[PDB]
Amino acid sequence: AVKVKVXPTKVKV
Amino acid sequence: AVKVKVXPTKVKV
Amino acid sequence: AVKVKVXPTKVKV
Amino acid sequence: AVKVKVXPTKVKV
Amino acid sequence: AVKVKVXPTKVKV
Amino acid sequence: AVKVKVXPTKVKV
Amino acid sequence: AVKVKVXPTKVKV
Amino acid sequence: AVKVKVXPTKVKV
Amino acid sequence: AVKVKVXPTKVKV
Amino acid sequence: AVKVKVXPTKVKV
Amino acid sequence: AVKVKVXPTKVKV
Amino acid sequence: AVKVKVXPTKVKV
Numbered sequence A, B, C, D, E, F, G, H, I, J, K, L: 001a002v003k004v005k006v007x008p009t010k011v012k013v
Helices: none
Strands: A003-006 A009-012 B003-006 B009-012 C003-006 C009-012 D003-006 D009-012 E003-006 E009-012 F003-006 F009-012 G003-006 G009-012 H003-006 H009-012 I003-006 I009-012 J003-006 J009-012 K003-006 K009-012 L003-006 L009-012
Touching: A003 B003, A003 B009, A009 C009, B009 I009, C003 F003, C003 F009, D003 E003, E009 G009, H003 I003, J003 K003, J009 K003, K009 L009
Parallel strands: none
Antiparallel strands: A003 A009, A003 I009, A009 F003, B003 B009, B003 C009, B009 H003, C003 C009, C003 D009, D003 D009, D003 G009, E003 E009, E003 F009, F003 F009, G003 G009, H003 H009, H009 K003, I003 I009, I003 J009, J003 J009, J003 L009, K003 K009, L003 L009
């Protein structure tokens, strides 16, 4: 899985 | 891969 | 996709 | 969306 | 509805 | 379905 | 929300 | 690295 | 991870 | 970050 | 720096 | 930006 930031939000998908 | 959406913003990772 | 909350974080996957 | 809880683990789907 | 896994448990919500 | 992780919290959507 | 069980699978929804 | 796609545009990061 | 722009969309991967 | 261009296709890294 | 693929072309930027 | 080439590989950075 990979760490991402989309807008203000970080998450790992 | 999967579409990620955060309010008005999207991308596919 | 579906809206989810994971820990404290909301996102749509 | 609806709260889901398995043992101690709460999330929202 | 969507297939999920919360803790050790798979189910559809 | 994909694992979604927020720090040490892991599930699957 | 309420605990539900089918034979093997329980979860609280 | 991971595929990233925005609308029609695919790349890898 | 690194800041990228793919089409019109800046994100971080 | 810098523009990266391959023929007509551009992005930024 | 990061490995990227821009169009058909891989490079590290 | 500037065109760079190495063996078979070119790109503009």
